[PDB]
Symmetry: C2
Subunit: 380 residues, 2 copies
């Protein structure tokens, strides 16, 4: 049941912004490890004296990496005269964010029909304002409200090329890397208390709950067409293994974004390419499930995937789950930085043709059961 209760017109995920200490090194690492191209920049060479911002793209996926310069470079500026291309940026907010949480997502950005209206309606419906609507070059409007912890939901709307004040990146500097990633599928928050978090976000967006010893309880909020998907987790305390949600909250100094799920047009090629690079600058993946997991794959998805497709899942450590309408292939990286906090999920969805409907196959909750069973069946 989807009651289509969005309080403003939402289109799709637009971009994810990381706040960094050094945007250059994080962006180069991510570009190589994920196969994303350098597509736009805003930094000293473009006249921005406040922050360095580099955009990576793969298909529709946009990763933005931002870090502050010395405040002394812009000490004479005021907000009306700023050279920052992202006017919501603030030196002390960024340094405090990074000192508090380490490397992580500052903004989850979605494209809307009118960022000014989305903001007003959101705050009218309980959203805590973060940065008021600002019009850039009479061309783009951006506004921000608090989502959870120090993560903001950022509204972007266009009259009719990333943001004003960004330049396209030199063809020589932009190597056309591509491992198959095409768009952001969902973005997941960890909070101490799921209930108040759900009530707050659903309160100001109008997003509806999406049809659903693991360490957590979770729920998923969705836009009208269910293309914007925002799960939220809370810990479940006092168990055999310690809750990874609780571990996150401790090392992140509170609530924040837990994982980004990136849809691939070919998860087997994406994982082959990422795994080749794991030990030469890229990303590591979580430990592979036992062969018992893959022995049991035939009995549950043998109708969707061939024996060779299933054997390819075993080589790459891919996980498989399934809904009543579709099948999900997924895998998780190890944490992206120093702290055991944010990680990435690679996913591909099979089914729900109508175009493919959002959430087709779920989010892999059934893989908790199948992993536990397999990781006792393999013991013998």
């Amino acid at each position: 049941k989807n009651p289509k209760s969005d309080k403003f017109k939402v289109k799709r995920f637009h971009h994810i912004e990381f706040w960094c200490g050094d945007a250059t090194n994080v962006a180069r690492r991510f570009s190589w490890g994920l196969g994303m191209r350098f597509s736009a920049k805003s930094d000293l060479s473009t006249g921005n004296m406040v922050h360095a911002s580099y955009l990576l793209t793969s298909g529709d996926l946009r990763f933005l990496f931002t870090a502050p310069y010395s405040p002394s470079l812009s000490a004479g500026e005021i907000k009306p005269t700023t050279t920052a291309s992202i006017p919501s940026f603030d030196h002390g907010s960024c340094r405090s964010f990074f000192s508090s949480h380490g490397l992580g997502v500052r903004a989850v950005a979605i494209e809307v029909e009118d960022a000014e209206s989305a903001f007003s309606i959101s705050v009218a419906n309980g959203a805590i304002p973060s940065s008021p609507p600002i019009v850039l070059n009479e061309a783009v409007t951006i506004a921000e409200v608090k989502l959870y912890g120090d993560v903001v939901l950022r509204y972007v709307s266009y009259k009719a090329e990333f943001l004003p004040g960004f330049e396209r990146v030199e063809d020589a500097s932009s190597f056309p890397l591509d491992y198959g990633i095409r768009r952001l599928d969902h973005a997941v928050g960890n909070v101490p208390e799921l209930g108040p978090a759900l009530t707050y976000v659903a309160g100001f967006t109008g997003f509806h709950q999406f049809a659903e010893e693991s360490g957590l309880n979770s729920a998923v909020l969705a836009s009208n067409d269910e293309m914007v998907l925002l799960p939220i987790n809370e810990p479940v305390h006092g168990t055999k293994r310690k809750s990874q949600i609780q571990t996150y909250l401790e090392h992140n100094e509170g609530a924040g974004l837990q994982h980004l799920a990136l849809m691939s047009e070919d998860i087997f090629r994406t994982l082959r390419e990422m795994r080749k690079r794991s030990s030469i600058g890229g990303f590591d993946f979580m430990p592979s499930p036992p062969p018992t997991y893959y022995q049991n794959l035939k009995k549950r998805v043998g109708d969707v995937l061939s024996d060779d497709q299933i054997k390819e899942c075993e080589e790459l450590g891919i996980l498989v789950d399934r809904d009543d309408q579709g099948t999900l292939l997924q895998i998780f990286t190890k944490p992206l930085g120093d702290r055991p906090t944010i990680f990435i999920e690679i996913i591909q969805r099979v089914g729900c043709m109508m175009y493919q409907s959002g959430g087709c196959g779920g989010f892999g909750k059934g893989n908790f059961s199948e992993l536990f069973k397999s990781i006792e069946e393999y013991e013998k």
Copy 2:
């Protein structure tokens, strides 16, 4: 003339430590871009609740990347009970360093016969203490004194494997990258005033001055065998082009380390490998000199390098200079991070066989003249 005035026994460069916001991402980028292997770690998985530290090695070159965790993880600790493997580390010093300078070198470390004595003698001779000698596992002694800005000179001495509390890195995580870099040749500071800087460092080390519109004046301090080489630059104001030393000081918020020079056993292979990776996560190089520069190469080094060796220099953008005892091949990267501050030099030295004596060929000062001449000769 080398009066061998070292006030304690110095052996050679030991390691360079970068203070980072996220050690993981800087270290992975550097590993891929320079061809260095992951060799040791000290982090949560080794019991260190204070900082994450990752060591990269290539030959004798050791790059250490360190970033602080949340202070909350170690709030109950005191210095006697610390889990930090580098006891001179301090959360607030590290965050203040990085907020002030961005990514850069915190420590230039040299191996000495006794770090306790080196420290005492240094301070007895004017050095500003930074961290007193501390003995690790009755096996290694480390101490630190101020060098310039917020950069420290770190003394390390061993009784007879990087540091106690570091673990060797997993063979699966340690891919054997190698592009030919073998050791640190020199490490260069930028200061507002060269005179007082020279007097201060030479005062407490006993290092002697090494035989010597560019934007700078510079001088080089050397150990007894001249294997430890520490140039220092100051700006020269009011000129056609703005001093790059002055640009550094402005963007770095004061004095600090300007460049690290890494000796290659085969600079042509090193530069081929680094240049292949420039646009896929590695390092960019400064713009290549004009063909006039390379046309003039025959008349000055045609006796050292063949026509093919000189043509290979032109393909790779290598610079060549020469002393009275040796020849220097060198090239400079673009800045390593967001700010136009620290960069890397790749070098190879030809001559001065005795083993090769330090500084063989100089530091490339003559390449200022030859670059200016070439960059007017090419105009026509």
